[PDB]
Design a protein around this nucleic acid. Structure first.
Lengths: 14, 92, 92
DNA sequence: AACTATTTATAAGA
DNA sequence: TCTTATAAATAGTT
């Protein structure tokens, strides 16, 4: 959930 | 196996499915052993032909994925092309 | 190998490192073959004892990780304990 | 879905 | 770091 959220958050911003 | 196979996509759906299940377990078993023998943490994410998800983690998938997100350094990164290049480097 | 080893942590640092390199390549090669034979996309994330990251992806790591984040369906999830339980079930 | 003959991977040597 | 003897994985059959 929140981990899935955090993963996408950091791959995006590249 | 009874015979050497070429690494190329299996067209027979049943064979492919049969191979997929067996080799996936194969792969997860090698990952377990690597993680224990060398004290490493491993996560594995697989999407089959049908875009269905299969996942493995030595201990906890979320722990590994977050540590991944926190990584801030140039590291070793390999793709199929690297492997294939390395297999010419070897041979016999 | 010349001898059957137990799956347990390798104490000799050099041996461990030597094993790590060879088995990781082993593991990535099995993943390459799985991804080609069965038209799968695969990502593999490994942290060694030194918390250094090694990654493999059949094609592109970021593509797989994002598709992971989009996944909302109950799927197969395995850990070391699953594998170990599955092996005790069938030795012969 | 079993079984096994053969291929592949690999532990230990040198 | 190579080489190879032996263990482990698996393709094809049934």
């Amino acid at each position: 959930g929140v981990v899935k959220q955090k993963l996408a958050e950091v791959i995006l911003k590249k | 196996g009874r015979k050497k196979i070429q690494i190329q996509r299996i067209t027979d759906e049943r064979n492919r499915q049969v191979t997929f299940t067996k080799r996936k377990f194969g792969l997860m078993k090698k990952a377990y052993e690597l993680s224990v023998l060398c004290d490493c943490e491993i996560a594995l994410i697989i999407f089959n032909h049908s875009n269905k998800l299969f996942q493995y983690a030595s201990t906890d998938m979320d722990k590994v994925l977050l540590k991944y997100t926190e990584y801030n350094e140039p590291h070793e990164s390999r793709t199929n092309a690297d492997i294939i290049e390395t297999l010419r480097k070897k041979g016999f």
